[PDB]
């Protein structure tokens, strides 16, 4: 199947309580593999998947230096952004950055991305061509001018198209057991009366990987999207995911309702029925 490597960085200011909180995590697909936490004792980039543990001391030293450099940049950013938006110190603010690369089933580069947000909203992002920027407001235009004058996109492009893809392939190979697996969902539906005249029908998918999945309800073949409660896909904690969708239906009409499950691990999409 297709694959991705992504790094996620969050910095949060806490004025009058010292330095900002900085957390970095890295993922291959839906499997986390590294972390750094600025408040933690180690001050090291740390392994969070078995297959990254074999990387040598140069790797861990080098990744620790990178993540500390990102932390210092974001620390400065929190100050700069307060100035750009004429904000006070009375409150906490959040910078987020995420970047990485996608590859197809043949492990060739599909696309790259490098995005930044301030207080939960898009701030600036590299466009699809990896040569130009989308700035979301006027403050982010200032950053665009500075990043264009400094040729930031060219350095990012070299990473996203090259280095990023090379390390993703390395990780896919070393962690093949975990990363190149598909676990198809184990599916069922549950039925519970909510009164003498209505029932909740809940369609379940369990123990699947990767996390991408579609669960839908139909009534006589007609999608019931406005009437469906669909929960966020959630981790089981063992490396697999769970999700459910529910509808509340008049008792006696169960046989009109079907749940439909799509996942890359299934040989064909499943239709679950009450008959």
């Amino acid at each position: 199947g297709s694959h991705s490597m992504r790094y996620f960085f969050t910095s949060v200011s806490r004025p009058g309580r010292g330095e900002p909180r900085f957390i970095a995590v890295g993922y291959v697909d839906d499997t986390q593999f590294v972390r750094f936490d600025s408040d933690a004792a180690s001050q090291r980039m740390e392994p969070r998947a078995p297959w990254i543990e074999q990387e040598g001391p140069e790797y861990w030293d080098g990744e620790t230096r990178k993540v500390k450099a990102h932390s210092q940049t974001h620390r400065v950013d929190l100050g700069t952004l307060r100035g750009y938006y004429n904000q006070s110190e009375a409150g906490s603010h959040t910078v987020q950055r995420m970047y990485g690369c996608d590859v197809g089933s043949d492990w060739r580069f599909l696309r790259g991305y490098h995005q930044y947000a301030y207080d939960g909203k898009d701030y600036i992002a590299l466009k699809e061509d990896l040569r130009s920027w989308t700035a979301a407001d006027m403050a982010a235009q200032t950053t665009k001018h500075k990043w264009e004058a400094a040729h930031v996109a060219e350095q990012l492009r070299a990473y996203l198209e090259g280095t990023c893809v090379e390390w993703l392939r390395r990780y896919l190979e070393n962690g093949k057991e975990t990363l190149q697996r598909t676990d198809a969902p184990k599916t069922h539906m549950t039925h519970h009366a909510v009164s003498d005249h209505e029932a909740t029908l809940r369609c379940w998918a369990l123990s699947f990987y990767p996390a991408e999945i579609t669960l839908t309800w139909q009534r006589d073949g007609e999608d019931q999207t406005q009437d469906t409660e669909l929960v966020e896909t959630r981790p089981a904690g063992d490396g697999t995911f769970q999700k459910w969708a529910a509808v509340v239906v008049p008792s006696g009409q169960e046989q009109r309702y079907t749940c439909h499950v799509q996942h890359e691990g299934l040989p064909k999409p499943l239709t679950l029925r009450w008959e």
Partner: peptide, 9 residues
Amino acid sequence: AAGIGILTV
């Protein structure tokens, strides 16, 4: 592995 070339805003 993570990136380098990360500049301040």
